Design an enzyme around this catalytic site. Structure first.
Site, PDB file in Angstrom:
ATOM      1  N   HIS B   8       0.803  -1.209   0.000  1.00 33.73           N
ATOM      2  CA  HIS B   8       0.000   0.000   0.000  1.00 33.73           C
ATOM      3  C   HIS B   8       0.847   1.275   0.000  1.00 33.73           C
ATOM      4  CE1 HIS B   8       0.862   0.931   4.207  1.00 33.73           C
ATOM      5  NE2 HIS B   8       0.778  -0.370   4.425  1.00 33.73           N
ATOM      6  N   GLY B   9       0.396   2.277  -0.751  1.00 34.43           N
ATOM      7  CA  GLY B   9       1.124   3.529  -0.818  1.00 34.43           C
ATOM      8  C   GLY B   9       1.242   4.218   0.531  1.00 34.43           C
ATOM      9  N   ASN B  14       3.304   9.232   7.688  1.00 31.93           N
ATOM     10  CA  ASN B  14       4.616   9.327   7.070  1.00 31.93           C
ATOM     11  C   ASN B  14       5.207  10.733   7.255  1.00 31.93           C
ATOM     12  OD1 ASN B  14       6.391   9.700   4.319  1.00 31.93           O
ATOM     13  ND2 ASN B  14       6.358   7.558   5.016  1.00 31.93           N
ATOM     14  N   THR B  20       3.847   3.423  12.996  1.00 36.55           N
ATOM     15  CA  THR B  20       2.460   3.011  12.816  1.00 36.55           C
ATOM     16  C   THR B  20       2.073   1.610  13.290  1.00 36.55           C
ATOM     17  OG1 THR B  20       2.607   4.371  10.834  1.00 36.55           O
ATOM     18  CG2 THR B  20       0.565   3.151  11.181  1.00 36.55           C
ATOM     19  N   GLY B  21       2.638   0.596  12.639  1.00 33.86           N
ATOM     20  CA  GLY B  21       2.310  -0.763  13.019  1.00 33.86           C
ATOM     21  C   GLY B  21       0.852  -1.121  12.780  1.00 33.86           C
ATOM     22  N   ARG B  59      -5.492   0.938   5.264  1.00 35.39           N
ATOM     23  CA  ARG B  59      -4.555   1.433   4.268  1.00 35.39           C
ATOM     24  C   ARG B  59      -4.294   0.468   3.102  1.00 35.39           C
ATOM     25  NH1 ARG B  59       0.266   0.218   8.537  1.00 35.39           N
ATOM     26  NH2 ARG B  59      -1.454   0.679   9.999  1.00 35.39           N
ATOM     27  N   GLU B  86       0.355  -5.526   9.415  1.00 37.16           N
ATOM     28  CA  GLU B  86       1.719  -5.020   9.490  1.00 37.16           C
ATOM     29  C   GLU B  86       2.318  -5.534  10.798  1.00 37.16           C
ATOM     30  OE1 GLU B  86       4.496  -3.962   8.399  1.00 37.16           O
ATOM     31  OE2 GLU B  86       4.427  -1.800   8.116  1.00 37.16           O
ATOM     32  N   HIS B  88       3.317  -5.491  14.287  1.00 34.22           N
ATOM     33  CA  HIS B  88       2.866  -4.715  15.433  1.00 34.22           C
ATOM     34  C   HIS B  88       4.131  -4.060  16.052  1.00 34.22           C
ATOM     35  CE1 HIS B  88       0.924  -3.699  19.224  1.00 34.22           C
ATOM     36  NE2 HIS B  88      -0.235  -4.018  18.676  1.00 34.22           N
ATOM     37  N   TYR B  89       4.053  -2.766  16.365  1.00 39.05           N
ATOM     38  CA  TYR B  89       5.211  -2.056  16.909  1.00 39.05           C
ATOM     39  C   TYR B  89       5.253  -1.896  18.425  1.00 39.05           C
ATOM     40  CZ  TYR B  89       8.702  -0.109  13.577  1.00 39.05           C
ATOM     41  OH  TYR B  89       9.742   0.161  12.707  1.00 39.05           O
ATOM     42  N   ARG B 113      13.935  -1.575  14.824  1.00 37.57           N
ATOM     43  CA  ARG B 113      13.443  -1.409  13.475  1.00 37.57           C
ATOM     44  C   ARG B 113      13.732  -2.528  12.493  1.00 37.57           C
ATOM     45  NH1 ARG B 113      16.003   2.576  11.090  1.00 37.57           N
ATOM     46  NH2 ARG B 113      15.152   1.885   9.073  1.00 37.57           N
ATOM     47  N   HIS B 181       1.114  -5.024   3.818  1.00 34.71           N
ATOM     48  CA  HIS B 181       2.082  -4.124   4.383  1.00 34.71           C
ATOM     49  C   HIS B 181       3.513  -4.569   4.132  1.00 34.71           C
ATOM     50  CE1 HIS B 181      -1.532  -2.608   6.477  1.00 34.71           C
ATOM     51  NE2 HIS B 181      -1.862  -3.884   6.452  1.00 34.71           N
ATOM     52  N   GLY B 182       4.456  -3.640   4.336  1.00 36.15           N
ATOM     53  CA  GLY B 182       5.870  -3.897   4.103  1.00 36.15           C
ATOM     54  C   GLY B 182       6.496  -5.084   4.808  1.00 36.15           C
TER      55      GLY B 182
HETATM   56  O1  LIG Z   1       9.874   5.747   3.301  1.00 38.61           O
HETATM   57  P1  LIG Z   1       8.837   4.937   2.610  1.00 38.61           P
HETATM   58  O2  LIG Z   1       9.358   4.001   1.587  1.00 38.61           O
HETATM   59  O3  LIG Z   1       7.647   5.707   2.180  1.00 38.61           O
HETATM   60  O4  LIG Z   1       8.271   3.956   3.755  1.00 38.61           O
HETATM   61  C1  LIG Z   1       8.226   4.380   5.117  1.00 38.61           C
HETATM   62  C2  LIG Z   1       9.048   3.402   6.002  1.00 38.61           C
HETATM   63  O5  LIG Z   1       9.120   2.052   5.533  1.00 38.61           O
HETATM   64  P2  LIG Z   1      10.501   1.376   5.005  1.00 38.61           P
HETATM   65  O6  LIG Z   1      11.581   2.147   5.660  1.00 38.61           O
HETATM   66  O7  LIG Z   1      10.392  -0.029   5.456  1.00 38.61           O
HETATM   67  O8  LIG Z   1      10.453   1.542   3.533  1.00 38.61           O
HETATM   68  C3  LIG Z   1       8.852   3.568   7.476  1.00 38.61           C
HETATM   69  O9  LIG Z   1       9.615   2.557   8.143  1.00 38.61           O
HETATM   70  P3  LIG Z   1      10.950   2.926   8.980  1.00 38.61           P
HETATM   71  O10 LIG Z   1      11.872   3.507   7.975  1.00 38.61           O
HETATM   72  O11 LIG Z   1      10.475   3.902   9.988  1.00 38.61           O
HETATM   73  O12 LIG Z   1      11.384   1.621   9.537  1.00 38.61           O
HETATM   74  C4  LIG Z   1       7.363   3.407   7.825  1.00 38.61           C
HETATM   75  O13 LIG Z   1       7.214   3.701   9.213  1.00 38.61           O
HETATM   76  P4  LIG Z   1       6.884   2.584  10.325  1.00 38.61           P
HETATM   77  O14 LIG Z   1       8.220   2.150  10.806  1.00 38.61           O
HETATM   78  O15 LIG Z   1       6.078   3.326  11.322  1.00 38.61           O
HETATM   79  O16 LIG Z   1       6.136   1.537   9.591  1.00 38.61           O
HETATM   80  C5  LIG Z   1       6.500   4.472   7.118  1.00 38.61           C
HETATM   81  O17 LIG Z   1       5.137   4.128   7.357  1.00 38.61           O
HETATM   82  P5  LIG Z   1       4.151   5.108   8.166  1.00 38.61           P
HETATM   83  O18 LIG Z   1       4.085   6.317   7.321  1.00 38.61           O
HETATM   84  O19 LIG Z   1       2.884   4.337   8.245  1.00 38.61           O
HETATM   85  O20 LIG Z   1       4.837   5.320   9.463  1.00 38.61           O
HETATM   86  C6  LIG Z   1       6.722   4.556   5.571  1.00 38.61           C
HETATM   87  O21 LIG Z   1       5.816   3.700   4.865  1.00 38.61           O
HETATM   88  P6  LIG Z   1       4.567   4.279   4.005  1.00 38.61           P
HETATM   89  O22 LIG Z   1       5.205   4.952   2.853  1.00 38.61           O
HETATM   90  O23 LIG Z   1       3.790   3.064   3.653  1.00 38.61           O
HETATM   91  O24 LIG Z   1       3.863   5.196   4.928  1.00 38.61           O
END
Ligand SMILES: O=P(O)(O)O[C@H]1[C@@H](OP(=O)(O)O)[C@@H](OP(=O)(O)O)[C@@H](OP(=O)(O)O)[C@@H](OP(=O)(O)O)[C@@H]1OP(=O)(O)O
Ligand SMILES: O=P(O)(O)O[C@H]1[C@@H](OP(=O)(O)O)[C@@H](OP(=O)(O)O)[C@@H](OP(=O)(O)O)[C@@H](OP(=O)(O)O)[C@@H]1OP(=O)(O)O
Lengths: 235, 234, 235, 234
Positions: B8-9, B14, B20-21, B59, B86, B88-89, B113, B181-182
């Site tokens: 998902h985008g 962000n 988030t988790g 999402r 996703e 869970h954080y 992380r 999710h990632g």
């Molecule tokens: O930078 P992007 O590619 O857009 O992805 C980021 C990222 O995911 P990756 O680093 O795994 O690509 C963050 O992860 P971290 O770098 O912080 O580990 C993640 O934050 P979370 O850790 O909280 O998942 C965040 O997501 P969010 O905006 O929901 O916090 C967001 O992903 P999205 O682009 O899907 O938002």
């Protein structure tokens, strides 16, 4: 049991003034807004769908997607059936309404439209507007799929799903939400409220506004139905 | 057998710099543009999903609905499972990523992380950011729902779904699509390609660009996974 | 929520003193009576299952059919999973239980039998006693199906199904009945009662006697479990 | 597409001269031997059911269990539905067939027995032979549940289930097995072959003998049906 009916907003063909029926047409930018308002109305009015029921026609699926996204309930279970589809318009699918009226004259035109049991002529199996052998209906008896319909014929195929499938969730204390179409929804309402064959032509269910039914153990209204926005509906 | 994976985008957190988790955060305006790009890639590149699988998080559900709307396949059967959620954080859900890096330092920050076996601390059950008692999980054994997770733990709860539920469709001849999710998606890739416990931290799945896997009868890649936008993929 | 466990009676192999495992062996004639006996016991004590779950092994499926017959609840929904199966006995499948004691010796025999986490040697793939490639498992990830199993391994595979699927009926207020085997059933009672890896070898669940559990909203026991025939269960 | 139909045998009421219908009467010792012969017939004639459909009346369910036990496919998935149920006899249910013939007379008795559309008087809701409120039907619209039927009415409520549910499995390439009743099975046969409203009374489906159908894409017979025991069926 509580049930919630939601009729989709206008489609891209409604705008172009074309007969739709089973033709898979997208929601217009205008109808996409009525869906948001339907969802806004669900959240606002404190009506919370436990399970979702839609047709196999995109416009109604979309309406549910948008409405449930404003309502914060995108997650709920979702079943799709051909029996919830709109009344197939037969030969008239994808034909200018104003042109139809001229070619058929005001009497015949009104029959095909607000008549309870008179179906449009059937559509040719090879027509560009024939969904005969359409991928989304490949696990259904080919012989049951209609090539034209009337409100009466719509009710006939809708009931079995309602009785078996939808009734199950209602009878399980689940608030059911149906995102359907004009004919199929008035069909459901005719059955529920015991409206006769003659009087059903008079019923209109507006778009982008949820209609709520509170039913007893026998699935018969415990009180009269009600929209979440009486003002907008009576207009 | 054919499999389509879609991350998902972007989401509403962000820009907030919040972990988030499991918090049911929504797509942003940009997330939605991405969803539709995924769908356009599906149609353009001719990949026609028969069945859809999403997590219980809005999402990805939003991403699925948007992409499918663009690919004209909005009608297909749809199933959802928390086992696709996703990672869970734990206590980190709802907290500033940058503030958290100042408290725990860089090394601990990277472990929380990107470590395979080490999970974050268990979230407090009364925290405004806890998904405990969430209605969308009320028909699931309460004792299994996580209070923190690691990619190791994620993979553990994800496999049973993939093993019984998703495989039935692939072995039935269906082209399956997963909007997830990632973490959970990387978890699955690791399982499918046999990526090491050490090597998995460096893998990244591009948001909104479909990853297609061509599987054999043993649900093992018969050729290497390809993205519908290879140049944008890497 | 009310859960009911029923361990199936002896098979035809148990009769011939052979290690069964996943081999699809049929219930012996005494096992059929033990089954009937089990049903007559659900009816008498007033335990009425609304849904049934079984394994893909005919011996347990058969136990349910006969039991539900004498109970007058033949009509209820039935779901069956390989995750509810018996422990796969590895290489020991289709081997005389007495010839295995001679061949391995006491400690090792008591290992491959009563140990919590040490599974038997994996059975050869081309062996006749091999469930690999079996039609009843053709829609399951090939890679997950065992070739030997331990009790530890069994709970790991069984737990997912109980958490997602079975828990749904319990949490929905439905009385669940499970027709499984020795290992799969004890592995579940272990889970329920918090019994340590150490004290599990000590537990036995008698066949043809329904073990009923009165759970709560968290699926944790309210009061202590109880058989429908405490005396024959304690015999 | 391959469909196998099996009629259940002798019930506890064959020696009683009573109108059965929807009463949940069970097999007799012979009814169980006929169900075993059907099972042995399946295994012997090499017809392997991939999935099962049955009514909600015990006599057909038993038949199915015993039959599959002998066939060795006890494991297959099983589905049940009221729409496969026997024809409901109305007020006649639980009544002596001979005393009935004295109350109505020959013509009216044959009409209630052999006609295509003249159903028996509606059974009173407070009759101990009324299926109203039986637990096996509590999740069905109370309104649609019959208080009497005819073969014509049976076919009307049976069809929807066949069209959506049964045909789904059939059109999926699975071999389907229905263990139903005399009316419901004949009702499906009248539809499958195009048998007239008046010629249907002349069709008799043997108890315990599996009737096989080789169907095509339109679910119409490719070749004529055949019992697994031709001589016994006649
Ligand atoms: O930078 P992007 O590619 O857009 O992805 C980021 C990222 O995911 P990756 O680093 O795994 O690509 C963050 O992860 P971290 O770098 O912080 O580990 C993640 O934050 P979370 O850790 O909280 O998942 C965040 O997501 P969010 O905006 O929901 O916090 C967001 O992903 P999205 O682009 O899907 O938002
Ligand atoms: O005569 P049989 O071959 O043994 O079959 C009969 C028969 O069914 P068919 O006529 O359809 O074969 C009876 O019907 P009638 O001849 O009296 O019309 C029917 O009785 P119902 O009228 O109640 O259906 C009865 O069933 P039961 O014994 O349950 O009364 C029984 O069928 P079974 O042999 O399957 O029991």
């Amino acid at each position: 049991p509580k049930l919630v009916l939601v009729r989709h907003g206008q489609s891209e063909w409604n705008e172009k003034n074309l007969f739709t029926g089973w033709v898979d047409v997208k929601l217009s930018a205008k109808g996409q807004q009525e869906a948001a308002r339907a969802g806004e109305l669900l959240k606002e009015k404190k009506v919370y769908p436990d399970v979702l029921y839609t047709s196999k026609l995109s416009r109604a699926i979309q309406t549910a997607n948008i409405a449930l996204e404003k309502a914060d309930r995108l997650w709920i279970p979702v079943n799709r059936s051909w029996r919830l589809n709109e009344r197939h318009y037969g030969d008239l699918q994808g034909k200018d309404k104003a042109e139809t009226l001229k070619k058929f004259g005001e009497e015949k035109f009104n029959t095909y439209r607000r008549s309870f049991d008179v179906p449009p002529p059937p559509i040719d199996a090879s027509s560009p507007f024939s969904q005969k052998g359409d991928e989304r209906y490949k696990y259904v008896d080919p012989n049951v799929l209609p090539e034209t319909e009337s409100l009466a014929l719509v009710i006939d195929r809708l009931l079995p799903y309602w009785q078996d499938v939808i009734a199950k969730d209602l009878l399980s204390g689940k608030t059911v939400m149906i995102a359907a179409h004009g004919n199929s929804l008035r069909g459901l309402v005719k059955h529920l409220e015991g409206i006769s064959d003659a009087d059903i032509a008079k019923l209109n269910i507006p778009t982008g506004i949820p209609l709520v039914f509170e039913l007893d153990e026998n699935l018969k209204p415990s009180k009269p139905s009600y929209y979440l926005d009486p003002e907008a509906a009576a207009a």
